[PDB]
């Protein structure tokens, strides 16, 4: 949605390691990255900030597959998966690589209990 790329980025994971010299933090273990309605799930996320310059950070996510979600202004969510997620914050787009897939949702429903009819019948034949 409008304003997601102006939000703080939150990253939660089981384990975190810092690479001082290389300007890199690596997250492993059910990593969840959020920024507004943007959500990325991965087994490993590498955050790089070349030259220590704020704004130029790069977020790379890896999974089997890693997943992506964002709500659009028009109200329809977008969702996808791929072996790798690449998000340069200065560039305002994400790159999905490796068996990549994207989809759009036009309807949904939440609850404690949902009942869904699995039987359709577009035609019937008689004798």
């Amino acid at each position: 949605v409008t304003g997601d790329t102006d939000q703080p980025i939150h990253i939660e994971s089981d384990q975190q390691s810092l690479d001082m010299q290389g300007n890199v933090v690596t997250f492993t273990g059910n990593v969840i990255v959020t920024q507004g309605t943007i959500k990325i799930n991965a087994d490993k996320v590498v955050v790089t900030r070349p030259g220590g310059e704020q704004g130029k950070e790069v977020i790379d996510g890896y999974g089997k597959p890693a997943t992506f979600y964002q709500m659009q202004d028009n109200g329809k969510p977008v969702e996808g998966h791929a072996s790798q997620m690449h998000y340069e914050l200065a560039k305002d787009f994400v790159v999905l690589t490796g068996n990549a897939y994207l989809q759009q949702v036009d309807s949904n429903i939440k609850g404690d209990k949902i009942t869904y009819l699995v039987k359709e019948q577009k035609m019937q034949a008689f004798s």
């Binding site: 790329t5 102006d6 990253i11 994971s13 975190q16 704020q54 914050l89």
Partner: peptide, 20 residues
């Protein structure tokens, strides 16, 4: 993609967070 945004790392076990 406009101004830089803060990046916050949180450890799941401890709940402790830090800016990175």
């Amino acid at each position: 993609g406009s101004k830089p945004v803060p990046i916050i790392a949180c450890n799941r076990k401890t709940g402790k967070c830090t800016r990175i």
